[PDB]
């Protein structure tokens, strides 16, 4: 059920196929280890704001920002 690369017009020889795939694999740049980054809420912007003592954003912005995981 994976999405495969497709070649739509012409057929390359095995040498041309290897060169095409090899250069595209080289173009596959990135982190080399893509995973969920370490959470660190220290000094998050939502703690910096002034909230009125009765402001509903204390629920729907501040708390949800801290508690969401």
């Amino acid at each position: 059920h994976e999405a495969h690369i497709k070649v739509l017009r012409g057929e390359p020889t095995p040498e041309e196929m290897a060169a095409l795939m090899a250069v595209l694999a080289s173009a596959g740049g990135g982190p080399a280890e893509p995973v969920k980054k370490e959470r660190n809420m220290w000094g998050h912007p939502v703690d910096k704001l002034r909230y009125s003592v009765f402001s509903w954003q204390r629920v729907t912005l501040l708390e949800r920002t801290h508690m969401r995981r």
Binding site: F54, S55, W56, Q57, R58, V59, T60, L61
Partner: protein
Amino acid sequence: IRFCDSYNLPLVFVVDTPGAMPGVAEEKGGIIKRGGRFFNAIVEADVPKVTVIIRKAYGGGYAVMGSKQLSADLNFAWPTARIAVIGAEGAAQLLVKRFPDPNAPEVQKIRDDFIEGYNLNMATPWIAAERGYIDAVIQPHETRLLLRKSLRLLRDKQNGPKVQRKHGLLPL
């Protein structure tokens, strides 16, 4: 609506209604308090609220099905929409309550001339559009991508000003 608000699902309304159902059995069934609870839930919900009006949107149906006045964020109508206090036949009967001799030949003519005028001039998208009660009248095919663009805009909606308190009371 209250469940969706509790789990932060955006709400999409697809209106096509004459409003509350008339009848003594529905009156005795609590339709005022049940409708008031529906009105309460729509206003209480903090999630993004987007509305598309298809065809009829009369009276309380217009109001309760996510009108802009009841805090809907973006309001669209198809060109078939019909926004009014009451439908043409109800307005006609409300006029024919005066000089009410419905056996007469001409009253059944002026009824149809009134209904024609009312469905051309009143029960349409265009007064709500020109007053800005709805934000756009759209070709129907636009709807799917319009809803994507809208809910992407509203993704971070913060509702306020609201006063935090133990809870909001509701008709019960």
